[PDB]
Amino acid sequence: TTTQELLAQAEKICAQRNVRLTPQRLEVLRLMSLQDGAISAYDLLDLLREAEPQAKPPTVYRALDFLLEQGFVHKVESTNSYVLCHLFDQPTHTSAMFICDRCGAVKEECAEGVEDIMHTLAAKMGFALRHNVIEAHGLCAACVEVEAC
Amino acid sequence: EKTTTQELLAQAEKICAQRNVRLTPQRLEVLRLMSLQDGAISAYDLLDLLREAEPQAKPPTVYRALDFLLEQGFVHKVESTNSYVLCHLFDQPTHTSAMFICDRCGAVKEECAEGVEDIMHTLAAKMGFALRHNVIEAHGLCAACVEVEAC
Amino acid sequence: KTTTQELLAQAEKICAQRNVRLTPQRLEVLRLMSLQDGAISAYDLLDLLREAEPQAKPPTVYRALDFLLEQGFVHKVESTNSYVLCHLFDQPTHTSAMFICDRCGAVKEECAEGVEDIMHTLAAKMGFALRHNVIEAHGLCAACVEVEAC
Amino acid sequence: TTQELLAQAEKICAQRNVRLTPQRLEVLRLMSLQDGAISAYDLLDLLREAEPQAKPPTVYRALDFLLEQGFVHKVESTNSYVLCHLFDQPTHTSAMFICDRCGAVKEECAEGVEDIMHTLAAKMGFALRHNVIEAHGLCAACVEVEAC
DNA sequence: AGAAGTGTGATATTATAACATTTCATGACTATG
DNA sequence: TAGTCATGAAATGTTATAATATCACACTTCTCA
Ligand SMILES: [Zn+2]
Ligand SMILES: [Zn+2]
Ligand SMILES: [Zn+2]
Ligand SMILES: [Zn+2]
Ligand SMILES: [Zn+2]
Ligand SMILES: [Zn+2]
Ligand SMILES: [Zn+2]
Ligand SMILES: [Zn+2]
CATH class of the missing domain: 3.30.1490.190 (Ferric-uptake regulator, C-terminal dimerisarion domain)
Incomplete structure (x- = not known):
């Protein structure tokens, strides 16, 4: 439910700004939130394919770019992975x-x-x-x- | 006055001699090729440089060399990029x-x-x-x- | 005896006559191509390949396809962006x-x-x-x- | 010679009761000024100097139109487009x-x-x-x- | 034997280029009628 | 009184490759019993 709260919070923030938190981005965000911490793009893609079977690398990378341009995730340069901001x-x-x-x-x-x-x-x-x-x-x-x- | 690039190479050879690890011609060539750089360099750029001498060279060569040099502490990996630089x-x-x-x-x-x-x-x-x-x-x-x- | 077996055997023989490596991966991709009614996209084929090689990714199928194209086992259908086995x-x-x-x-x-x-x-x-x-x-x-x- | 075919296009787009917008016309103009095949996104890059708010649907819709009439051909094996002879x-x-x-x-x-x-x-x-x-x-x- | 090194082809991993369509909200012509 | 047509803007889908890194085998070489 911390995840719920987090997603709601993100929706509120994205609502404040003039920006679109799509179901895809929201889904990726949810997945990353449920993860303890860091995760590679492709494992995340594999997770993403559970709900969106047609998902491909550009999908998750786009979602990440979005979540990166907003303040929701950080890249972890020394592991080529990604994590939520606290x-x-x-x-x-x-x-x-x-x-x-x-x-x-x-x-x-x-x-x-x-x-x-x-x-x-x-x-x-x-x-x-x-x-x-x-x-x-x-x-x-x-x-x-x-x-x- | 800081240590010169060449002094580092001599030092590298002798340090490897002291540790009983093998600073082979390849690893040496890679080391010097890296030492000539005015900054960091990528593995495949380094590979491309290494080809002018050893055209038969492939990525495993460079990566093995880099692993060795990294382990012996002569080189650092720049993680924000994906490049490698000599340690001065x-x-x-x-x-x-x-x-x-x-x-x-x-x-x-x-x-x-x-x-x-x-x-x-x-x-x-x-x-x-x-x-x-x-x-x-x-x-x-x-x-x-x-x-x-x-x- | 089955067409697929015979086919893979032919391929294995040709890739031996030519000094070339028909690896398990390439063989699997070819096997999959042979079991298709007709044409298949690289990504559908990837999805099929993942059933046997779960780690498979686009460069995998594109490499296998490039090889199978080089050796003349598959044709590319340019107007549909797809691939078929050669008859x-x-x-x-x-x-x-x-x-x-x-x-x-x-x-x-x-x-x-x-x-x-x-x-x-x-x-x-x-x-x-x-x-x-x-x-x-x-x-x-x-x-x-x-x-x-x- | 470009203006000639540009005019001819309208002349023919009269006989066939279909609307040739400055959009499609501009695309056709750019296609004509090009002495060879061109990709949709390069064409989009060219269309942007005229209409900087242009986006892929724009050029693709245009191309679909120009294709359905006979003005341009698609080169399938290069994913590019060329003006007709x-x-x-x-x-x-x-x-x-x-x-x-x-x-x-x-x-x-x-x-x-x-x-x-x-x-x-x-x-x-x-x-x-x-x-x-x-x-x-x-x-x-x-x-x-x-x-x- | 045995541990370490190299050559070579293929594969694995991370990320993006390149090509095309969907969505949906908005306005602009038109066939009744 | 709607009907199709055309566009505008963001996102997504689809196809293919760039950029980075490792595996796996074979042959060897140089050392250790
Ligand atoms: Zn821990
Ligand atoms: Zn943070
Ligand atoms: Zn500078
Ligand atoms: Zn250092
Ligand atoms: Zn049919
Ligand atoms: Zn054929
Ligand atoms: Zn020529
Ligand atoms: Zn023609």
């Missing part, structure tokens, strides 16, 4: 991604200090950065407890 | 790094940052997250492309 | 006329050497160097006519 | 000779092929509604280029 209605934001290499779970946190260090490092050199990519690989708490036995 | 900091003990990437000219700078590792560990510590490795990659413009914008 | 692997490269029913979708392949000759002559009048002909007819087949008559 | 003649059947190098397309008549196709269809129970006849190779020019 907070929707906010604008283009830099967030730090903690990715479990075991379960695929992703925790999204703020890291102003990092942005700042990079902001200064870009300035002590001649760099004008537009965007930071901050992805951490490791193990989440559960998977940590599991890997210790 | 492997003469010291293994390190954390942030890659600064120009979207246009494509050049990249590896710059150390303990202050990032610490914050990441701190953020990872509050949650129960056993951090292992960091990917820090910055996109924007370097102060060559910047002075082309100002015209 | 006779025995012949070398050949100019084939395709009769395509816009109702049932079935496709019949016919020989027409005359056409090759005419096109060659016509191309030879000008300075055109002919490589391949594309000859496809659209209409209704006998069955669809019988049906439509009522 | 001359559309003063009755609804003919084109045999398209296509250069795989330069992309030049030469429309010719091959009534013999059609005849044969009809006989073959006739010996079957096949009701032949339309034939597609296309050749791929090298135009004379490209041959002479490759000769060197």
Whole structure:
């Protein structure tokens, strides 16, 4: 039902803006929401084919592009996968991604200090950065407890 | 004054000798070919370069080489792209790094940052997250492309 | 003994006479092509291929098709963007006329050497160097006519 | 010479009580100004300088119209479209000779092929509604280029 | 033996180019009549 | 008083390939008993 609430919320946001949250996009969103965290496009496509048997890569990639242009999903560059954002209605934001290499779970946190260090490092050199990519690989708490036995 | 490109290669050879791992002609050629780049490079571009010498070369060659070089820490993979760059900091003990990437000219700078590792560990510590490795990659413009914008 | 077996055997023999690799994947794709009434799209064929190779993706079927095209086991139907099995692997490269029913979708392949000759002559009048002909007819087949008559 | 055929088109689109919009006319104009085959999306790119709000349905509808009248032919084996040789003649059947190098397309008549196709269809129970006849190779020019 | 390396063809994975249609809301001609 | 025709705008469907990466086998080479 958190999924329901999430979808409703997304519908509300997309209703606010002049943008169309289609059944397809909504479906993809639902699927990704039900997923714990990260997922590749093609596994997601395989999931999508349950409800839309004719679905092909452009379908899911289009849905993702849409959900990416809006603030609903993030790409995970170091795994070629995608995940939901933990907070929707906010604008283009830099967030730090903690990715479990075991379960695929992703925790999204703020890291102003990092942005700042990079902001200064870009300035002590001649760099004008537009965007930071901050992805951490490791193990989440559960998977940590599991890997210790 | 930072370490020269050639010193890194010599250092690579001797380090591989110290570890009893084989820095073969191929892996060496790949290493130098990468070292000549003014920034990151893709596997197939590198493959194309490698062909002028070894035309019989295929992707497995390049990817094997890259896997080896990555394992020995001479090369970094740039994850936001899908490219590979020489490490200009492997003469010291293994390190954390942030890659600064120009979207246009494509050049990249590896710059150390303990202050990032610490914050990441701190953020990872509050949650129960056993951090292992960091990917820090910055996109924007370097102060060559910047002075082309100002015209 | 069955047509499919015989066919795959022929193919296996030809792909041996020629020093070429008829892999399980290619064999499976060909097997599937042989079991079709007529023409099939690359993606329908992919969907069929996924029943045996669940990981299969578009480059898979397109590679298999490119191979089967190179070796002359399948023809591409350009006007419908589809593929059919060749009726006779025995012949070398050949100019084939395709009769395509816009109702049932079935496709019949016919020989027409005359056409090759005419096109060659016509191309030879000008300075055109002919490589391949594309000859496809659209209409209704006998069955669809019988049906439509009522 | 473009204006000539443009006018002729209207003249013929008078006799046949169908409406040739500036849309379809513009498409036909662009098709004419092109000295060879063209894809729908390139044509769409060209149609946009005139009508920047143009989109694929626009050009496709246009092409469907221009196709159904006899002004343009579809080249099935290249998924492209070409202007007719001359559309003063009755609804003919084109045999398209296509250069795989330069992309030049030469429309010719091959009534013999059609005849044969009809006989073959006739010996079957096949009701032949339309034939597609296309050749791929090298135009004379490209041959002479490759000769060197 | 045995572990590591290479050559080669084919396959697997991720993403997009390229080509064509659907939908549905909106306006613009027209056949009664 | 509607009827078809034409368009406008977004999304979707459909076909095919680009771009990235690995597998699987065979042959080998150089080392280890
Ligand atoms: Zn977020
Ligand atoms: Zn975990
Ligand atoms: Zn480094
Ligand atoms: Zn730059
Ligand atoms: Zn045949
Ligand atoms: Zn039929
Ligand atoms: Zn014509
Ligand atoms: Zn030519």
